[PDB]
Amino acid sequence: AFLTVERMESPIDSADDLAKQTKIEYGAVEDGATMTFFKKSKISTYDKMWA
Amino acid sequence: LNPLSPDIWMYVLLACLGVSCVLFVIARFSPYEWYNPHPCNPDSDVVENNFTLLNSFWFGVGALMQQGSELMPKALSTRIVGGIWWFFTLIIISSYTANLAAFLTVERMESPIDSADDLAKQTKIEYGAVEDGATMTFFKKSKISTYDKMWAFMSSRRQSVLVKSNEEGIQRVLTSDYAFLMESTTIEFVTQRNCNLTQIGGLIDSKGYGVGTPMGSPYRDKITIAILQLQEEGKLHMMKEKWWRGNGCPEEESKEASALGVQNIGGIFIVLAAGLVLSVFVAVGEFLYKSKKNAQLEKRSFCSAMVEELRMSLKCQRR
Amino acid sequence: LNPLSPDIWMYVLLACLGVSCVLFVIARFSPYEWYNPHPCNPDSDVVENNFTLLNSFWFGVGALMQQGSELMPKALSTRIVGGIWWFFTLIIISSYTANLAAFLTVERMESPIDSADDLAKQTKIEYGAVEDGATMTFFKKSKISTYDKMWA
Amino acid sequence: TLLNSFWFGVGALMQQGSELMPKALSTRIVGGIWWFFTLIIISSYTANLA
Ligand SMILES: CCCCCCCC/C=C/CCCCCCCC(=O)O[C@@H](COC(=O)CCCCCCCCCCCCCCC)COP(=O)([O-])OCC[N+](C)(C)C
Ligand SMILES: CCCCCCCC/C=C/CCCCCCCC(=O)O[C@@H](COC(=O)CCCCCCCCCCCCCCC)COP(=O)([O-])OCC[N+](C)(C)C
Ligand SMILES: CCCCCCCC/C=C/CCCCCCCC(=O)O[C@@H](COC(=O)CCCCCCCCCCCCCCC)COP(=O)([O-])OCC[N+](C)(C)C
Ligand SMILES: CCCCCCCC/C=C/CCCCCCCC(=O)O[C@@H](COC(=O)CCCCCCCCCCCCCCC)COP(=O)([O-])OCC[N+](C)(C)C
Ligand SMILES: CCCCCCCC/C=C\CCCCCCCC(=O)O[C@@H](COC(=O)CCCCCCCCCCCCCCC)COP(=O)([O-])OCC[N+](C)(C)C
Ligand SMILES: *[C@@H]1O[C@H](CO)[C@@H](O[C@@H]2O[C@H](CO)[C@@H](O[C@@H]3O[C@H](CO)[C@@H](O)[C@H](O[C@@H]4O[C@H](CO)[C@@H](O)[C@H](O)[C@@H]4O)[C@@H]3O)[C@H](O)[C@H]2NC(C)=O)[C@H](O)[C@H]1NC(C)=O
Ligand SMILES: O=S1(=O)NCN(C2CC2)c2ccc(F)cc21
Ligand SMILES: C=C(C)[C@H]1CN[C@H](C(=O)O)[C@H]1CC(=O)O
Ligand SMILES: C=C(C)[C@H]1CN[C@H](C(=O)O)[C@H]1CC(=O)O
Ligand SMILES: *[C@@H]1O[C@H](CO)[C@@H](O)[C@H](O)[C@H]1NC(C)=O
What we know:
The structure is cut from a larger assembly and holds 4 copies of chain A.
Chain A: H1 16-20, H2 35-39, H3 46-50
Bound molecules: the ligand CCCCCCCC/C=C/CCCCCCCC(=O)O[C@@H](COC(=O)CCCCCCCCCCCCCCC)COP(=O)([O-])OCC[N+](C)(C)C (5 copies), a molecule of 4 linked components (NAG-NAG-BMA-BMA), the ligand O=S1(=O)NCN(C2CC2)c2ccc(F)cc21, 3-(carboxymethyl)-4-isopropenylproline (KAI) (2 copies) and 2-acetamido-2-deoxy-beta-D-glucopyranose.
One copy of the ligand CCCCCCCC/C=C/CCCCCCCC(=O)O[C@@H](COC(=O)CCCCCCCCCCCCCCC)COP(=O)([O-])OCC[N+](C)(C)C sits between chains B (13, 16, 54, 57-58, 61, 270-271, 274-275, 278) and C (76, 79-80, 83-84).
C-alpha cells in the first residue's frame, strides 16, 4: 500500500472543483477579458465563480 | 525482473559476493567456529571448519531464496552476519513481491510512427490526404524540411495515397496499412465513436473554420460579432459537446482478467533451461578435474576417466 | 487454479519432473557428491550418494512449495541445479500470490449503464417507454440535451 | 510418534519446516499434499489481507 499510493494530487482539477472548494481563493486581473468573461456568464458553474 | 531497478539487481548480486566474502573471513579467525569433528572421538586433536568458500557462498545464495541451507553458523560473530543477511533478504523480497502486482500486466505497443517526423522517414506506412483540400495544399506550398519530404512522397504516388474524401480515408486506415492526415476536429469525432483509431502525433499547423462571405459582403462583420456572441455565452462549446461526444471508447482500464501465461511469466523457463545446461558443463568439469587429480597417482587421462565412467553406468556401485 | 493459465501449470509440472531428473543424473555423475558416510569411523573406502531418484523428486517438490527438503546438494555441479530451481520457484510463487490478489478483489458485475447519460452515449442497449404515457411526453418536451438525445 | 506427527502438521503449516522429513513414499505423498494445502491457504490469506 505504501509503494503504490500517488505523487500528490491537487485539491482542484477543474473549475467546478474550485467552485465548490471555497478554501482556495479565486483570482483574475482588474478590467481584463478574464473577469469580463465571468461577469457576462450564466452557465451556473462560472456564475458561482463570479459570485 | 522489473519491480526492482537494474542497479538494485546489481547491488543485491554484489551483496551476495560481499557478505559471503565477509562470512568466509570471519569464520576462519573466529576461534569458536572451529568445532570438533568425529562424533565418536577420543576427544581430539583435530579442528575442522565447515565454512569453505564454496559453503560461504552457498549460505548467501541459500538464505536469499528463503530455502535455508544445510549449515547454520555457530560462533556469535558469524551469527550476526547471518542475522543481518536474513533481514536484508527479508526486505528485498517483501519489496519485490509487493511491487510485482503492478509490473505483471503486459501493455500495448507504441505506434511505429509518433509524429510527422517519424512518418516522413519511413516507406512502409503509406500516407496521404484528401486531394484539393486545405491539407494537400498545405504540403503543396510548404518549404520546411519535413513537410516537403511528405509532399515528395505524395506527388510520386498521387493516384494511390491521395483519397478523394474523408470516408475513403478512414476506410483505408482500417482496410490497409496507411496513415491519413486529417484536420484536428474530425479526428476528435472519429476516434471517439470508432475505437481502433487514434490521433498519432500533435497538430502540424493551426488554422480554423469560418463562415465564408464574398469579397465585399457586409455579412462578414455581422457574423464576426455574432460568432463571438455565442462563444462567451458558451453556445459554441455546447453545440460541439453535443456532437463530438459519443461512445467514448472507455476500454483503457479493463482489469477484469489476465491469468498469467507464457507471455507474462514466460522467461524463467529460459533462465531455468540456461541454468541446467550450465550445470551439465560443470559436471563435466568435476568429472575431469577429479580424474586429473586421480591422474596425479596413475595414467594420463583415459584410464582414470573410464573407471569413473563405468561405475556411473552401474548406478549402484558403492565401493 | 486461475492466476496461472492452464499451460503454465503444465510447464511447472514438466519442469518439476524435468529439473528433478537432471539433478539425479548430475549427482551420480559428479565425483564430489560421493562422500564417505563415516566421519568418526576410518573403516574403509565406503562411498554413498544421497540422491536416489525418489530423493531427487523430493528436492524439486520440496523447494517448489517453499518447505525445503531433508537433503541438500554438496558438489558445485548440483548446487547450480539446486540454486536455479530455488530462483525458479521464488518467482513462480511470487507471481502466483501477487496475481491471486487481483482475482479476489475485482467486482461483482457492473452494468454498462449507471445513469441516463450513460445510456445516451451507449447506443448498443436500446431505449423504451410506453406509447402515450407521461414518460415519452417528458422527453418530447425536454431540451436539456441529455434527454433530447434520448428522444432523438 | 503422535507427538512428532502433529509437529509435522503444525510445522508445515507456518512454513517453517520441522526437524523430520518423511521417508517411505506413502508418507511422502501425505507430506507432499499437505504442503500444497498450506501453500494455497496462506497464499489466499496473505492476498486477501490487504
Ligand atoms: C517484520 C520484520 C521483523 C524484522 C526483525 C525486527 C526488526 C526491528 C527493527 C526496528 C526498527 C525500529 C525503528 C522504528 C522504525 C520507524 C522509522 C524510523 O525510526 O527509522 C529511522 C531510523 O531507524 C533505523 O534506521 C532502524 C534500523 C533497523 C535495523 C534492524 C536490524 C535488526 C536485524 C536483526 C539482527 C540479527 C542479530 C542476530 C543475533 C543472533 C529513520 O526514520 P525516517 O523514516 O527517515 O523519518 C524521517 C522522514 N523524513 C526524512 C521525511 C524527514
Ligand atoms: C557456458 C559456460 C560453461 C562453463 C564450463 C567450464 C567450467 C569448468 C568448471 C570449473 C570449476 C568446477 C571444477 C573445479 C573445482 C571443483 C569443484 C569444487 O568443489 O572444488 C573446489 C571449488 O571451490 C571453489 O572455489 C568454488 C568457486 C566459487 C563458487 C561460486 C562460483 C560462482 C557460481 C556460478 C554462478 C556464476 C554464473 C556465471 C555466468 C553464467 C573446492 O572444493 P574441494 O576443496 O575440492 O572439496 C573437496 C571435498 N573434500 C575435501 C571433502 C574431498
Ligand atoms: C547469486 C550470485 C550469482 C550470480 C550469477 C547470475 C548473474 C547473471 C546476470 C547476467 C545479466 C546480463 C544482462 C544482459 C544479458 C542479455 C542477454 C539476453 O538477452 O538474455 C538471455 C537470457 O539470459 C540467460 O539465459 C542467463 C541465465 C543465467 C543462468 C545461470 C544461473 C547460475 C546459478 C548460480 C547458482 C548459485 C549456487 C551457489 C553455488 C555455490 C537470452 O535471452 P533471449 O535473447 O531473449 O533468447 C531467448 C530466445 N528467444 C529470443 C526466441 C525468445
Ligand atoms: C504455484 C504452485 C505450484 C504447486 C505445484 C504444482 C501444481 C500443479 C497443478 C496443476 C493443475 C492443472 C489443472 C489446470 C488448472 C486450470 C483450471 C482447471 O482445469 O481445474 C479444473 C480441475 O482441475 C483440477 O482439479 C486440478 C487439481 C490439481 C491438484 C495438484 C496437486 C499436486 C500436489 C503435489 C503432489 C505431491 C507428490 C509428492 C511426491 C514426492 C476445474 O476447472 P474449473 O475452474 O472448475 O472450470 C469450470 C468453471 N465453471 C464451473 C464456471 C464452468
Ligand atoms: C563494510 C564491511 C564490508 C561490506 C561488504 C558488502 C556490503 C555492500 C554494501 C553496499 C554495496 C552497494 C552500495 C550502494 C548503496 C549504498 C549507499 C547508498 O547509496 O545508499 C544511500 C546513501 O545516501 C545517504 O543518505 C548517505 C548516508 C550514509 C550513512 C553512513 C553509511 C555507512 C553506514 C555505517 C554506519 C556505522 C554505524 C553503526 C556501527 C555499528 C542512498 O543513496 P542516495 O542516492 O543519496 O539517496 C537518494 C537521494 N534522495 C533521498 C534525494 C532521493
Ligand atoms: C490487428 O492489427 C493488424 C495490423 O494492421 C490488422 O491486420 C490488418 O487487417 C486488415 C483487415 O482488417 C488487412 O486488410 C487486408 O487488405 C486488403 C487490401 O489489400 C483488404 O481489402 C482486405 O479486406 C478488408 O478488411 C476489412 C476488415 O477490416 C473487411 O471488412 C473488408 O472486406 C476489406 O476489404 C484484407 O483484410 C491488413 O492487410 C492487415 N495488415 C497486416 C499488416 O496484416 C488486424 O486486422 C488487427 N486485428 C484486429 C482484431 O484489430
Ligand atoms: O488561420 S487563423 O485565422 N490565423 C492563424 N491562427 C493562429 C496562428 C495560429 C489561427 C488560430 C486559430 C484559429 F482558429 C484560426 C487561426
Ligand atoms: C495583463 C493583462 C491585464 C491582460 C493581458 N492579456 C489579457 C487581455 O489583454 O485581455 C489580460 C490578462 C487576463 O485576462 O488575465
Ligand atoms: C401504464 C401506463 C401507460 C401509465 C401508468 N402510469 C403512467 C401514467 O399514467 O402516466 C404510465 C406509465 C409510464 O409513464 O411509463
Ligand atoms: C476493432 O478491431 C477489429 C477491426 O475492425 C474489429 O473486429 C473490432 O470490432 C473493432 N472494434 C470496434 C469497436 O470497432
